[PDB]
UniProtKB/Swiss-Prot annotation:
Coiled coil: none
Organism: Escherichia coli (strain K12)
Modified residues (N6-acetyllysine): 241
Protein name according to UniProt: Large ribosomal subunit protein uL2
Gene symbol of the encoding locus: rplB
Effect of residue 229 to Q: Loss of peptidyltransferase activity in reconstituted ribosomes. No change in rRNA binding or assembly into ribosomes
GO biological process: cytoplasmic translation; negative regulation of DNA-templated DNA replication initiation; ribosomal large subunit assembly
Amino acid sequence: AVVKCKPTSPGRRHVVKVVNPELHKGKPFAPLLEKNSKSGGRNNNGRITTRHIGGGHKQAYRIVDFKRNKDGIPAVVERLEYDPNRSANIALVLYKDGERRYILAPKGLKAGDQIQSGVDAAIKPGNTLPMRNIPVGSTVHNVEMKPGKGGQLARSAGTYVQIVARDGAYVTLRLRSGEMRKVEADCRATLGEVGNAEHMLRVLGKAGAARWRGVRPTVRGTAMNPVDHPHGGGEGRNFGKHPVTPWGVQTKGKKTRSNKRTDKFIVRRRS
RNA sequence: UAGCUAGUAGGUGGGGUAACGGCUCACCUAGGCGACGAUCCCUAGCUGGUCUGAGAGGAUGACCAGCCACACUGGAACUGA
RNA sequence: GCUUGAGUCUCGUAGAGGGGGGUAGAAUUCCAGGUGUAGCGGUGAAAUGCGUAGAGAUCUGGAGGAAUACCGGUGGCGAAGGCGGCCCCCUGGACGAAGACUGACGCUCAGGUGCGAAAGCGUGGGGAGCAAACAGGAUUAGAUACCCUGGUAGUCCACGCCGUAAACGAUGUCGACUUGGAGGUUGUGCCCUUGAGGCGUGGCUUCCGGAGCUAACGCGUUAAGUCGACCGCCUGGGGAGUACGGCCGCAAGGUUAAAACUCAAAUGAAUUGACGGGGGCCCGCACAAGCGGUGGAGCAUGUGGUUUAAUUCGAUGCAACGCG
RNA sequence: CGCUUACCACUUUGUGAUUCAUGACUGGGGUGAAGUCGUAACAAGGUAACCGUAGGGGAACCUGCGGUUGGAUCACCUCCU
RNA sequence: AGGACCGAACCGACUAAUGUCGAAAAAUUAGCGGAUGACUUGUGGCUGGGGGUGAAAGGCCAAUCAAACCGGGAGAUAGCU
RNA sequence: GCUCGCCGGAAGACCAAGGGUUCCUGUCCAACGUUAAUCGGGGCAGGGUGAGUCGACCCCUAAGGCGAGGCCGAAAGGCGUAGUCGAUGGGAAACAGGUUAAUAUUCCUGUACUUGGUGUUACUGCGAAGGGGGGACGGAGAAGGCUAUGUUGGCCGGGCGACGGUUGUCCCGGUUUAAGCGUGUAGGCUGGUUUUCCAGGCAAAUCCGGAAAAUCAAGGCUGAGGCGUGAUGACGAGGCACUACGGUGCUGAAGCAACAAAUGCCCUGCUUCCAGGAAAAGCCUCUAAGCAUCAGGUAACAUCAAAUCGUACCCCAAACCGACACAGGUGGUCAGGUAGAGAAUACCAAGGCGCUUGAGAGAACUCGGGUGAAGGAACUAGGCAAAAUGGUGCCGUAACUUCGGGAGAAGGCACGCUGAUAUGUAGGUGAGGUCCCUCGCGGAUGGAGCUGAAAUCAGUCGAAGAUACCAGCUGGCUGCAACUGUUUAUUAAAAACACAGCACUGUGCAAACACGAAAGUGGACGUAUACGGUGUGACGCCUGCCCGGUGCCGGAAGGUUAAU
RNA sequence: AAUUCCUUGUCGGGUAAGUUCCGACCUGCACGAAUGGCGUAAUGAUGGCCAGGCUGUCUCCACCCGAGACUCAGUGAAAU
RNA sequence: CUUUAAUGUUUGAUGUUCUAACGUUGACCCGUAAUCCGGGUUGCGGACAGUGUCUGGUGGGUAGUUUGACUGGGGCGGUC
RNA sequence: CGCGGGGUGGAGCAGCCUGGUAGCUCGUCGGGCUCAUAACCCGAAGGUCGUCGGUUCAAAUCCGGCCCCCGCAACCA
RNA sequence: AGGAGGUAAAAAUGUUCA
């Protein structure tokens, strides 16, 4: 729940937390882990390509299953685990045979729900089945782009994908952004919206709160000198340039959309 | 103006006043007052009577007269019934 | 002690009373596919807007959100606000019945507590339509309006807050008594149900009116009639339901609540008239159906104005202007 | 008697409450024969009014929502044996 | 619980004096700020010159930075001394 | 050698790093030392570093580096798969005493332990670059159980004392003991056991995991410290004894209890929150391709092996880094007595030092400080600097407010010592005795001893009782920025930057963007409740008018319009 | 006004005296609503102002204890 | 000539479909215990995308440079 | 620079591919409008339709050459 | 008797005193 803290001190007076007692408080499941070192925004060359990245709490990568290629096998959601690499929660599923995996936690979910995957599973939140078996107009998530890629669209807290039309070979999805892109009918998708939908309401409150997230300080252009940023200079807070990126590319209304090989799949762009 | 009092509510003993009594000390009990209005603030001498009013009341308390308080301001005491 | 007060029990009745969970149909909007072509949408007229990228129209399928056609009624329920597609679960009250039981437990009620339309507010979702604010188009002397195309918050759901309305039958509550008629609505008794029924007895309610009452209008067995019990409130208008303080509130403010000053009116019902871009009937060269003129030209003449030593004076909507 | 002690007023120091004048200045209000702009209400006031409430606006007031009547008018033209 | 309070270690460096051919090529003394955090620190790596890095001063990049150092162009050029 | 002063959470004692013989002894004084110098980190010569258990090498990985083929690029070269390196990380095993001029958990005495090679004996199925378990883990907080360690008492030894008292409640000193083995406690964790079956674990599996039955209720794992043993041993104050007078040999009693108590250990625990907290190998176990009179494995025993390098000295400094024997810097460990909350501070212990120029004088002037009559900011750019306040407990505490604060606001009262309440209380700890028992390191009851706040009353001394060191100045008006925080190292610490929050906009994944000739990477093993860019900068009330200039987005028919 | 040149604007308070300060008037040379506007509890080694306390800051310096200065002995620079 | 309708013809384009070029940061198999790579199946796009050559536009992101003299000091003014 | 395009009462804009009609509105004179004003409804000023020439029954119009404007690629004494 | 469908765009203002 969105618990509003008390103003006992500066900094703690604005922080808004999201508690979740339904979440199992124990240590993570060992069989599905491996190290995940930070990169700090440094590529092969070592130079910082993406800025504002560094620090943050150490965390391990939990190999969650997006693919879902297990058919005709019922699974039981054992318990909900907290995933530091996502925005949404993850349920630790336990299959009938005994192999365990993680799946993005859908909305209506608790410890003990029954799910399965295939091409015959009934329409119930948590089941994975191709997008031709799923009725027109339903709400899905974790939609796969290529028939076997794994899962691309709708992978964050509270997001979903609405199948709008199945024109035979393809399936038109009404994306989260208002985008309407056609995807193959053979692509696997999982029903129901993604849980932990109140993640958005959480505020960080402190400047250091953003630090342990991983976000490093971001300096404004007018605070710099002429050589570091196209804006800079001035005797005191002067402007007069046209808003751009640190590398000359115009911002504030400037489309960078240009691929032309994917222009076949888009019905209506975001407005 | 909604809570107020802390020798303050009462009791015991000593003392104290012409005399009763927290009137004053020590100890014990934790009570006492309060919406039929405590405390607080503002105002004011009260009355017998007076002016008016059909009566009921309203306003008021100068002159006559009974009582209370003060005597530059405040505190204290003696004398003496 | 008792019982005509009040309260309780057994059997049932009517109902948008209230809370929660699902479900159904119509329509609007949006979307995909097929058909198909220059309009579509809108107005007092017009335009912004939409459309030859292929709309509107139509058919199929889908998605959502809010409201529930007809039933439906000055009909019903509830204290009031308010509440209606349907089904289930929990639950409140009122009412009728033939008896019994307790035996005044009663009525009212400053303070205090709870509920309390909409608008608005905080947190979280949702978001079709409608639509503050806003945008453009028109209209217009101006139009930051009425009209139109779009459109955010809002309107809907959950948890809290706010606590105000012409919250009004402008009528506080309980109980008793005081001629009737015409209906609705809901129990129940008896007689031949001898047929769409007939005669009584309660609850609630609609209209008209007697007594009576009132300033009148009007209320009139649900009373503003006749009385009693208890509570809130008012003492000219404005100032002002405002100032200051307290309390409550996230905020917007709410609640409690004066004085100074100024005026001598403010206010109600109702009458006679005048008026309305109110209604109705009737009348006239009023309009309509026509004919010939005026204004345009020249000129006679009157007048205003201008001019002038003076161009006497007056008249100057219709009702001055070939008038005195 | 002097000294000392308890009580004690005048008085001082620090910090609150309440109240009266004064206070540059400012909001609103009342008022003043013959000002300005607009025309909001009064008939259906020419978009019905008013209450509550939100937002907007040179002024009145305009718009949305719910509510109330302290709002007027229901005569004329096409269908039926 | 806390980018919470007081305050040593530790980190930092606001005021003043000394020092300025100094004890030192930015310290000492007496006072200051943070001190469970955006903390500090060891060891070890990575990013490079029109490039790096920068809670952004044109600051730092080996006592040197509006473009590091070394070597080579190169005995650059100098209407100047 | 005798007095004296200083540090004592260091100016003490040890490692890593880093230096490189500076360590020790003999001898020498030109140069070096800021003076002299028979002295020394200086010269010359000689001597010194002893390891199966310490560290490294070694085995295994992290960041990251190199990188067969490979992809890519004028060449150089770049990136990267398998692999292979890379600790500050994980992994086997030792403690006490003695000895040297210098080294020793290394040599000697004593008592132990670990991992492998081979052989013997009795049994048994063993066997991977493969699977599972383990290794393997965050921050903060509270408590309990103990220990290092210290104090007091008892006991033993020496003294009874150069000025008054001191055979007594007296004084001084000592009262030390590990590794390993056995028990398996305080405490914590987990419900154990057997059977059957199975689309799972790149193949298989008796092992892991899962699904239903049966049976009993505990079993098992882990674990500081204590107690025995180690040890009728060593050590040990003090004597007995020779002096090259530095020291050596010899001997050697007491060696317990109680209380207080860590930041050490249990704890790689437990509770809670969120920002959600390495990897691989060692080790245990199961099987595949296979191999079974074998080979190997389990257990016991015998014996052998444990190699190579470092090891001296300095390590908060005259030996490192700063040109110096430089008032600077340098990570980690132990850290005692009294007062005290404390690792502050004051004085001391162990231990180590008096900082490598001194002797006189007692001027102006300067630095570092002490005190100051009367006044009290009049000084001055400005209360800059000094002065002053300063602790604990209790009482009491305004405007304003985001209802947390403001606030330790402000301003006052009591503070020493002695006795009594009480031959030291409340409280803590707690032997003996007694009883019971699923008998052990048990549980109740029990109360001596030990230790020990604070409050009240009375008395007493001084000018002052938080007496020293130590240790807030407070209040009012107001600009700016919300606040913690960051920055011009070496003149600027601020109102500048950052900041959570807010808005616009870009991005549909081979994502935008960025580094890079390219490949490939970061973004992200994330995917619109996400990420990038820009602007403003908590929170509250809001955030107006203008689309011509410029930029961007959208419709492009017409005009012009390159290459071809 | 961190913005007002003219200017030490004018009025009131604060002082014996106030170009600074505090509260207002609008004549805004040349504020202005995310290059955000106006407020705002707490916080600040922040800027300006006032009062108390406190004092050698100062009136007006005086005295004293240490380290140099000075004399002697030894070593022995520098800028110019 | 203005305006236009059918046809043939000459080209620029557009629509749609297909699979063999090409892409494939889809799945699967093998080289191989290796998320690179290469090849083989197969799915999805598809003559697009993307790359080279030439060319127009934009382009302070980057680079090389210019920005006069006289002047009763220079700048402004004015002049040549 | 060679293709385009445009000049209209005092000002602002149609008329322009089709020739024959120099108009629509703001502003100024007035006339109506009502009992009055404002408002609107309306008539008239006043434009060498850039200059000049050229086709034709006839010119802003269709045509030309030259002045004046503004949008394009341009331009190496 | 008993009940339905269709039917009005725009026009402000008029000194005080009596």
